[PDB]
Design a protein around this nucleic acid. Structure first.
Ligand SMILES: [K+]
Ligand SMILES: [Mg+2]
Lengths: 77, 97, 214, 244, 124
RNA sequence: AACUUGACCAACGGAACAAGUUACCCUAGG
RNA sequence: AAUUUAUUAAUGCAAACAGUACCAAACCUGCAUUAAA
RNA sequence: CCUGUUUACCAAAAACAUCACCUCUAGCAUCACCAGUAUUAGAGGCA
RNA sequence: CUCCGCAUAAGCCUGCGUCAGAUUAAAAUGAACUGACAAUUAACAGCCCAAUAUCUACAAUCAACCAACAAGUCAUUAU
RNA sequence: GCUACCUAAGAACAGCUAAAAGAGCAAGAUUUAUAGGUAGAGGCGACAAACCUA
RNA sequence: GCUAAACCUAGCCCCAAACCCACUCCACCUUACUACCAGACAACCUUAGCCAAACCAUUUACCCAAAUAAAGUAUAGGCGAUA
């Protein structure tokens, strides 16, 4: 079955993580402390960020199922 | 492992000095390729029964491909280290006792 | 800005999609295929080539009604808007496909050869031996990639041990599993070849610029 | 005009200034050392002296290593010292013939290796030489610990050494949590390589990684002068009270 | 032919360039749909002007004034004049204890203050 | 092994080993 | 025209790999062989 | 053997392009060809 | 005489406004050169938009009739 | 930023025969503004071996 | 008699010795010098041709830590040039 959306237009897959993460008991030295990217240090893993307050112009709505009015039975409008 | 040698001689650098290499010293000739050589057996001490050598604790000269792929990862065999040889030797002695 | 393919839509729709011409250039911006350039603006109609694609909740064979048969600028064959259940899609139109007709798409192989009806889609194994077929897929569920041009039709020569042998329009034998869906009949616009371009200018309208080898 | 120091010494001068100077002395030595890697792509001369056949005279002979190019991919894997050989050859092995550019690449394979100290399985790219080297060392953990940095020629390999070395130095209970007896057995087998935890931390780090690690250690918030002055005033008051 | 040396400003370039570039004025709001500008009152700087009635200081100083030596203020001098007296009294009375630095005006952190010294969050 | 031998290298004092074409021509002085 | 096949494809060998006496996946690397440009 | 560009221009001529015509290669999809599938696509010749 | 002209866009960047000049054009009033002073004020224009899913087969041409082919700039709903 | 080709999204074209629309006289294989792409072992070329800021 | 002529400083050169640089405020990788929104592009890979061989086809040079000497010696090289 032909799938729609060519690979070239889809977001590039994440780069391969540094192998220092694989090694147990080792803390990869990253550029998070520098506050900018450098090619010679490992890429940091950042925890998901939340604004912590309401900003109408940058609002994100919850998942559709979580909506209070979500119903399992569809309605045709 | 490709092994090469230089066509042109390199003049002696002297004690505590590194040779000065000119453009001619980059020309090489292929002395030998290690892959094109008869394979050698890998000595292993078996820790479990195997169709070829059921005898546990028996030194075997299995093919390197077979030993690496199956015997060593699965724990059927262990390397023929001096330390390992002593440990199994005692079992062969204790069993007779 | 570097070349970005227009083929970025991920969700199927019957709405014509705006296309971007390439001019014979690849992503590097260098000409790869010569003689391609300009022409009339064209919108893409997402043609569904997996004839047997039941709706999300529903399963098994289903029927569709031919709402419309119309010209397609992106291909030689004509296309048909078919409505089944609550879903519409674009398919390739057979020689005698007409508005209002009902067509059947089934993935069931009967004990014998079911009657051949133009525009229906059954598994090759179910289709009678020696029937004109179109829009055949190489693998079960891959989707029709062959016999898709106007007026083209392959024949089902024989079925042997769970496989089917079909003659492609180039008179070449092709062997596929018997669970491969296909469409009975010839493709629309059987008289496509007869048409004469007549005027050099018409070639430019079709997006084909002069190509001088030397 | 002339520079005070030769330009080739400027790098060493950098290590005497700023953050680089504050790096541990043991780590700095590793950078200064210039050990010769084991011959891989050439055959070394057996002795210091040889008898010249042409004139029958004893003449000094020196080993000149072949320049090896290590692509970035090799740093992820373990190639056992092998690398690309970028040079030239004579067509049909004839000096009179045109000189042609030539590259000799190693044969790479994907293999699975299990580290007893780390108790993990790794998928790494290796050559046949790496497999042979592991056999002569009786296991990956021995090969990684035994081999020096110049021989390993791999950033991943030096990263593994820090992992294994830190576990031995820290006596980490995380290895085989349910079986303390098994944990002790593995640690006993590698006791020789156990080095202090302080030194083990800086094993295999690059200069950039070491500088960043030292920057984080040094990084501290400035102390408010309110706290500093309070300590001085209280000390002055106490001394004044003592004199009284 | 283009003038490289001259200062780049919003007067130059086509309509898109001229609109986007400004002259350094601080924004006081945002743009909504339809290019409607919404002005945020808080963003607008509020001028805090005092009451000058009955104020004796004037733009200039009389020339008949005793010249004095210039002594720039320092952190130590401020501590000796604003914080040292309170600690000195408490130390004699024994009430003073390190844990209670805040009693003399020490701020462990700037968080939660309207005017935070570092990072400075207030205008001159 | 030695003693020795070998290019019509004939453009014959012999470059170890290489042609056409340019009326699209490029450079050089006479 | 001579020089060359570094280069690109094609094939062979070795290399790697597995299974029920006898044979096995392309890729990859090394070495050959004609071609291509 | 249709018309179109080209130097020239009233222009002629030739060249190239090109409708038609002819042979040649190709049984297939997620960056060109092409979101196409031999009534297709590409490469040539065409007096 | 009109060959244009006015405006916008693009470009340009104060480049015939006032005052003064010993500077300048063939021209010791003019001045586009020099010094000083002044100036173009937003309604036009630029500068835009919360999220997630979902919707979008029917050209344009006075769009009606008769037609086509090279098959087309123009649209949502739910929370 | 010239020019050649191409991409995106624009724009222009009086009258006359006027069925047919067509460089007919005077709506096209036309012209044209904007932004972008293809770079010298190359690009582009209805191929002059031309053009790619002389 | 005009046009002109004349000038002595600005600095500069080569050495020696010493290892240099740089956060008033504000602005500056977007169309730099532009107060203020969900990133993700990431660096590493033989210098080449050619001075010459009176052509050119292998062949010559530009770095690796002490002035001098060993020594233009050993040695390499169409064993030629030359190194
Ligand atoms: K101007
Ligand atoms: Mg407005």
């Amino acid at each position: 079955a032909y799938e729609w959306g060519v690979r070239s237009t889809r977001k590039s897959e994440p780069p391969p993580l540094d192998r220092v993460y694989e090694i147990p008991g080792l803390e990869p030295i990253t550029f998070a402390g520098k506050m900018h990217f450098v090619p010679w240090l490992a890429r940091p893993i950042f925890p998901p960020w939340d604004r912590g307050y309401k900003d109408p112009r940058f609002y994100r709505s919850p998942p559709l199922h979580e909506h209070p009015l979500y119903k399992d039975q569809a309605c045709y409008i | 492992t490709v092994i090469v040698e230089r066509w042109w001689k390199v003049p002696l650098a002297g004690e505590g000095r590194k040779p000065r290499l000119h453009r001619r010293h980059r020309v090489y000739k292929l002395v030998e390729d290690t892959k094109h050589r008869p394979k050698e057996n890998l000595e292993l001490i078996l820790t479990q029964s195997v169709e070829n050598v059921g005898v546990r604790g028996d030194l075997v000269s299995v093919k390197k491909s077979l030993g690496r792929n199956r015997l060593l990862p699965q724990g059927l065999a262990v390397y023929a280290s001096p330390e390992n040889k002593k440990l199994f030797e005692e079992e062969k002695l204790l069993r007779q006792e | 800005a570097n070349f970005v393919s227009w083929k970025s839509r991920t969700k199927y729709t019957i709405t014509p999609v705006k296309m971007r011409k390439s001019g014979g250039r690849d992503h590097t911006g260098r000409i790869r295929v010569h003689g391609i350039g300009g022409g009339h603006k064209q919108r893409y109609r997402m043609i569904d080539f997996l004839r047997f694609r039941p709706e999300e909740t529903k399963s098994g064979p289903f029927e569709e009604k031919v709402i419309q048969v119309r010209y397609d600028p992106c291909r030689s064959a004509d296309i048909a808007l078919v409505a089944g259940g609550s879903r519409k899609r674009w398919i390739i139109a057979t020689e005698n496909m007409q508005a209002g007709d009902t067509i059947l798409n089934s993935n069931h192989i009967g004990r014998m050869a079911v009657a051949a009806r133009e525009g229906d889609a059954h598994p090759l194994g179910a289709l009678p031996v020696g029937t004109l077929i179109n829009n055949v897929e190489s693998e079960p569920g891959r989707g029709a990639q062959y016999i898709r041009a106007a007026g083209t039709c392959g024949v089902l020569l024989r079925k042997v041990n769970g496989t089917a042998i079909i003659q492609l329009p180039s008179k070449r034998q092709m062997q596929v599993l018997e669970t491969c869906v296909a469409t009975v009949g010839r493709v629309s616009n059987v008289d496509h070849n007869k048409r004469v371009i007549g005027k050099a200018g018409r070639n430019r309208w079709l997006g084909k610029r002069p190509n001088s080898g030397r | 005009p002339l520079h005070k120091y030769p330009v080739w010494l400027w790098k060493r001068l950098q290590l005497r200034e700023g953050i680089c100077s504050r790096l541990p002395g043991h780590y700095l030595r590793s950078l200064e050392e210039e050990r010769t890697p084991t011959p891989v792509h050439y055959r070394p001369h057996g002795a210091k002296f040889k008898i010249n056949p042409k004139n029958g005279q004893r003449e000094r002979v020196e080993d000149v290593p072949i320049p090896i190019y290590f692509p970035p991919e090799s740093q992820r894997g373990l190639w056992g010292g092998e690398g690309w050989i970028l040079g030239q050859i004579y067509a049909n092995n004839d000096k009179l013939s045109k000189r042609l550019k030539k590259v000799w690449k190693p044969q790479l394979f994907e293999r699975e290796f299990y580290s007893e100290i780390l108790d993990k399985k790794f998928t790494v790219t290796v050559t046949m030489r790496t497999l042979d080297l592991i056999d002569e060392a009786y296991g990956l953990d021995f090969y990684i610990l035994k081999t020096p940095k110049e021989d390993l020629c791999s950033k991943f390999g030096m990263d593994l050494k820090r992992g294994m070395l830190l576990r031995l130095a820290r006596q980490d209970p995380q290895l085989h949590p349910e079986d303390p007896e098994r944990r002790a057995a593995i640690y006993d087998k590698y006791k020789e390589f156990a080095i202090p935890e302080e030194e083990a931390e800086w094993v295999g780090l690059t200069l950039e990684e070491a500088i960043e690690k030292q920057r984080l250690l040094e990084e501290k918030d400035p102390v408010p002068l309110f706290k500093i002055y309070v300590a001085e005033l209280i000390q002055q008051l106490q001394q004044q009270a003592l004199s009284e | 032919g283009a003038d490289r040396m001259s200062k780049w400003t919003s007067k130059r370039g086509p309509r898109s360039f001229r609109g986007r570039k400004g002259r350094g004025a601080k924004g006081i709001g945002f743009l909504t749909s339809g290019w409607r500008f919404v002005q945020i009152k808080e963003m607008v700087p509020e001028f805090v002007v005092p009451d000058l009635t009955g104020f004796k200081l004037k733009p200039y100083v009389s020339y008949l004034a005793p010249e004095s030596e210039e002594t720039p203020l320092t952190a130590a001098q401020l501590f000796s004049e604003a914080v040292a007296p309170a600690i000195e009294k408490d130390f004699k009375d024994g009430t003073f204890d390190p844990d209670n630095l805040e009693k003399y005006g020490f701020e462990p952190t700037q968080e939660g203050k309207l005017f935070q010294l570092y990072p400075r969050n207030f205008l001159r």
